[PDB]
Design a binder for this molecule. Structure first.
Ligand SMILES: O=C1N(Cc2ccc(CO)cc2)[C@H](Cc2ccccc2)[C@H](O)[C@@H](O)[C@@H](Cc2ccccc2)N1Cc1ccc(CO)cc1
Lengths: 99, 99
């Protein structure tokens, strides 16, 4: 799916039987995601980006549906104010930054 | 220029006769950039993302060359550990997130 709209390319993601807006974060290397409803079987970690380091849960193997398209990947669940989709997911949906 | 390489789409940008690695961050809305020497003419501000809020300088009208291509835009110079290229710049180089 092409997504330009000279604005934030957000995609309705479907993780842990849930749906939220995801900020296509081609900048991040993984798909972070504000706290949500995910089952255990994950690993505790912390990302360090702009402002400070937040705590998230590396959920490897999460069927996140972006753009009505199935896409499993590592979703980090933490206190992030946005559902970040990094390369870990831009590689499953085949996202490409052509400019 | 198409950039997938299932990894971080970094691009050597040339801002104010300067050059650094820019993490193509379609997630951000503007082009943040670790502290550096910009062409003056800017305003003090602070972005609030992952971890906390960092302080940057909205440098509006900065000739940032991405992919050997000239591209003026708003480069926020602050204590960011990376040169983020948000939509503000993904709209000048005509970037498109297709997956
Ligand atoms: O912290 C941000 N991370 C941090 C981050 C770390 C780890 C992951 C998962 O691996 C994802 C995101 C990225 C930028 C960055 C990456 C690495 C080092 C330094 C910076 C991201 O790529 C960017 O999209 C937004 C995400 C965001 C945006 C809004 C609200 C919450 C989170 N930010 C913050 C940001 C804020 C404003 C601008 C300018 O508009 C740019 C970035």
């Amino acid at each position: 799916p092409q997504v330009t709209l000279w604005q934030r390319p957000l995609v309705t993601i479907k993780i842990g039987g849930q749906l939220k807006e995801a900020l296509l974060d081609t900048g991040a290397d993984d798909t972070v995601l504000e706290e949500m409803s995910l089952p255990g079987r994950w690993k505790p970690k912390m990302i360090g980006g702009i402002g400070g380091f937040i705590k998230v849960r590396q959920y490897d193997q999460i069927l996140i549906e972006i753009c009505g398209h199935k896409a499993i990947g590592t979703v980090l669940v933490g206190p992030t104010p946005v559902n970040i989709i990094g390369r870990n997911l831009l590689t499953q949906i085949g996202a490409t930054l052509n400019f």
